[PDB]
Each structure stands twice: as structure tokens, then as C-alpha cells.
Amino acid sequence: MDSKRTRQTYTRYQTLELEKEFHFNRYITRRRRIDIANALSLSERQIKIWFQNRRMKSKKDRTLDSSPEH
Numbered sequence: 001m002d003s004k005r006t007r008q009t010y011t012r013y014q015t016l017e018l019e020k021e022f023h024f025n026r027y028i029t030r031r032r033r034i035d036i037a038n039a040l041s042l043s044e045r046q047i048k049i050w051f052q053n054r055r056m057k058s059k060k061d062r063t064l065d066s067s068p069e070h
Contacts, residue, residue, distance in 0.1 A: 005041030010050075014042060022054055 010018070017040050021028060028036065028051065037044045054060060062069050 007043045008046060010042065010046075014040065018042070018047065018050060022051060026055070027051065 006014075017036070021032070021036055025032065028047070033044060033047050036042075037047055042050075059069075
């Protein structure tokens with residue numbers, strides 16, 4: 001039938017798949033980001049913004065003088 005799977009919007013699963021890429025490549029290769037964006041099904045735009053955000057997502061961020069702020 002038709003398909004297109006979620007250009008925007010996220011789930012625990014989706015975010016998990018994104019997370020296990022993010023710890024791989026905090027900046028993904030465009031190939032991998034396209035691949036993921038295809039198979040995972042969340043847009044290149046989205047994943048750019050998600051990964052761009054993630055950097056400073058105010059927990060995975062503020063290792064205060066490299067301490068585990070956790």
C-alpha cells in the first residue's frame with residue numbers, strides 16, 4: 001500500500017535507535033544518516049536537529065569539570 005513512515009515525531013523505540021547511533025557517531029555520516037532516516041524512518045532534517053540538540057541536552061551535556069553530573 002502507500003507508506004512514508006513519520007517525517008517528524010518520535011517514540012521510545014525511535015529515540016533508542018537514534019541514541020545507539022548517537023553514541024556511535026555524534027555527527028553521523030550523511031550516508032548513515034540517510035540510511036537510518038530511511039530504515040528507522042525519521043527525516044534527515046529531523047535527525048540533524050535531534051543530533052544538533054543532543055550535544056547540549058542538559059544531562060548528556062554538563063560534565064562539570066569532567067565530573068559525572070549524571
